């Protein structure tokens, strides 16, 4: 039975006393994505509450792998300058977007994020190689960590460009971007760009 | 970098050739001896001098060291 205190503490919050859920709603106990090359670089094994941690992840090379992927998605929305900082908006925008996803699909909203990321990381990329000034591209592979880093970039960049001069609010454009990407649908801006990079990478082998 | 300078290498060297019996393999004790054995002008330098001496006692334990 819920504890009674001099200062009342609602029962809905007291339910979390036996398990931690993000934003008090979404759970972490069933989220796993099959791409075996990224299980060590998507952090969904430590539940958190508010997607606002203030962690010190910049001091060492690979520490950013242990940051929960929900906050690393949150962190990428504070861009295009005017919105640098202003992290609270990011915590709220992720809240609306997740609620929307579970309305539109009836699947765990976090699972959508992990699926979309694992379907967007480009496997093959290219670099400039030459000598004296003449430059031609070369085919190379792409590391696990970088597939996540570039995956999130494409997702938030696509959502942000849509929200510009468009009636749909930011929370939605990211919601439809995430739904499509996990669906492996060419309508998504993220998947369009994954295929374009891979196609150029194959022509330059 | 963690490369000591000659004012530390030589000061520790002088201590071992004159006070081997009293030094130990422990920083804290060696910290207090250097106060009773040598006149040093700072807490920072005194820590460094004693730290190297501990390091040299460890070397001498495994076998003699040139110099």
């Amino acid at each position: 039975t819920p504890v009674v205190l001099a200062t009342p503490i609602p029962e809905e919050v007291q339910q979390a006393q036996t398990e931690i859920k993000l934003f008090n709603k979404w759970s972490f106990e069933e989220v796993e994505v099959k791409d075996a090359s990224l299980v060590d670089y998507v952090q969904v094994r430590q539940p958190i509450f508010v997607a606002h941690t203030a962690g010190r992840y910049a001091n060492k090379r690979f520490r950013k792998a242990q940051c929960p992927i929900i906050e690393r998605l949150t962190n990428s929305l504070m861009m295009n300058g005017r919105n640098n900082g202003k992290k609270l908006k990011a915590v709220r925008i992720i809240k609306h977007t997740l609620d929307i996803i579970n309305v539109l699909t009836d699947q765990n909203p976090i699972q959508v994020v992990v699926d979309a990321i694992t379907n967007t990381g480009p496997r093959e990329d290219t670099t400039r190689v030459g000598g004296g000034g003449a430059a031609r591209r070369q085919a190379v592979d792409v590391s696990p960590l970088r597939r996540v880093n570039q995956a999130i970039a494409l997702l938030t960049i696509g959502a942000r460009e849509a929200a510009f001069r468009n009636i749909k609010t930011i929370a939605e454009t990211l919601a439809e971007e995430l739904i499509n990407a996990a669906k492996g649908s060419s309508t998504s801006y993220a998947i369009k760009k994954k295929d374009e990079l891979e196609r150029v990478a194959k022509s330059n082998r | 970098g963690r490369v000591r300078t000659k004012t530390v290498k030589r000061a520790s060297k002088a201590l071992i050739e004159r006070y081997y019996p009293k030094l130990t393999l422990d920083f804290q004790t060696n910290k207090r001896l250097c106060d009773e054995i040598a006149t040093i002008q700072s807490k920072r330098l005194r820590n460094k001098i004693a730290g190297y001496t501990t390091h040299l006692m460890k070397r001498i334990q495994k076998g003699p060291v040139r110099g």
Partner: protein, 141 residues
């Protein structure tokens, strides 16, 4: 005298002085219930110490905090750390050791900031720029 204890926590310029004494579970921040903390979104940060251990541990104690300095975000980090430290200092003085160790294990395993302050502090600005490491634009023609 009534059993009591004092602790505090910090982040940037925020400081929260938490006073604890045996009681009936009162928990209050700046004279208002914990429930009314603002900004709203970060409220579960203030709740975090209570959940990670269990509300049972708080039924026999009264906690009153008062926070000053800093900004709207750093304060919430001061508050949660004052609550975490206060509870472990109360078990330090009036309850056995085995309980103190277990409680510190729950907090440490989750978020070190609940017990140990953040070491980061700002760097001074330097002349020739707008900030610590930024510099004014340079021109050659």
């Amino acid at each position: 005298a009534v059993p009591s204890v004092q602790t505090f926590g910090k982040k940037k310029s925020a400081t929260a002085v938490a006073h604890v004494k045996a009681g009936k579970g009162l928990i209050k921040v700046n004279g208002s219930p914990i429930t009314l903390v603002e900004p709203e979104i970060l409220r579960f940060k203030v709740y975090e110490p209570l959940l990670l251990v269990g509300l049972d541990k708080f039924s026999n104690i009264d906690i009153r905090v008062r926070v000053t300095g800093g900004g709207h975000v750093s304060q919430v980090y001061a508050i949660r750390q004052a609550i975490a430290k206060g509870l472990v200092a109360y078990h330090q003085k009036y309850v056995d050791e085995q309980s103190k160790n277990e409680l510190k294990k729950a907090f440490t395993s989750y978020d070190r900031t609940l017990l140990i302050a953040d070491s980061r502090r700002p760097e001074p600005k330097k002349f020739g720029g707008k900030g610590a490491r930024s510099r004014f634009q340079k021109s050659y023609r």
